[PDB]
Amino acid sequence: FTITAPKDLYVVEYGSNVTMECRFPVERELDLLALVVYWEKEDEQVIQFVAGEEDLKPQHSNFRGRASLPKDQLLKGNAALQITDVKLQDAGVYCCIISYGGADYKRITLKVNAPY
């Protein structure tokens, strides 16, 4: 079991949206109840999807209502993190962690260009 992140780094503009791919193999048919997904950013949880239960942790989360896991991508084996209305603070090293049978992780860097 190994996850593939084709893009190692993403460069985006302040105020825009970004979707960071994180793909895992589905042999035959997907059992959401066996799937665990965490996205972190430098020892800070962005979002999690654990056996069908999603938690944004918007308890003073820095991504209160801007982070999501589109389920049309989850079902295709892509645990993509979508961040809307990006801010400078969002730049950094993200970690995508998946457990589906086995477990693996990939680091992904986000760069945010500011206005002039």
Residue numbers in the entry: 19 to 134
What do the authors report?
To fill this gap, we crystallized the N-terminal PD-1-binding domain of the mPD-L1 protein (amino acids 19-134). The obtained crystal diffracted to the 2.5 Å resolution and contained 10 protein molecules in the asymmetric unit. The crystal packing did not suggest oligomerization of the V-type domain of mPD-L1, consistent with its one-domain human homolog structure reported previously (Zak et al., 2015). Similarly to the human PD-L1, the mouse protein shows the immunoglobulin-variable type topology with canonical two layers of antiparallel β-sheets (ABED and GFCC’C″). Protein chains are well visible in electron density except for the two variable loops: BC (Val44-Leu47) and C”D (Leu74-Ser79). Several significant differences within the tertiary structures are noticeable, mostly in the variable loop regions (BC and C”D loops), which are distant from the classical inhibitor-binding site and do not participate in the PD-1/PD-L1 complex formation. However, a detailed sequence and structure comparison within the hPD-1/hPD-L1 interaction surface demonstrates a similar arrangement of Phe19, Ala121, Asp122, Tyr123, Lys124, and Arg125 between human and mouse PD-L1. The most significant spatial rearrangement of the key amino acid within this region is a dislocation of the Tyr56 sidechain in the mPD-L1 structure compared to the hPD-L1 structure, resulting in ∼7 Å displacement of its terminal hydroxylic group. In addition, three amino acids involved in the formation of the hPD-1/hPD-L1 complex (Ile54, Arg113, and Met115) are changed in the mPD-L1 sequence to Val54, Cys113, and Ile115, respectively. Although the sidechains of Met115 in hPD-L1 and Ile115 in mPD-L1 overlay relatively well in the superposed structures, this replacement introduces a branched aliphatic chain to the already crowded space.
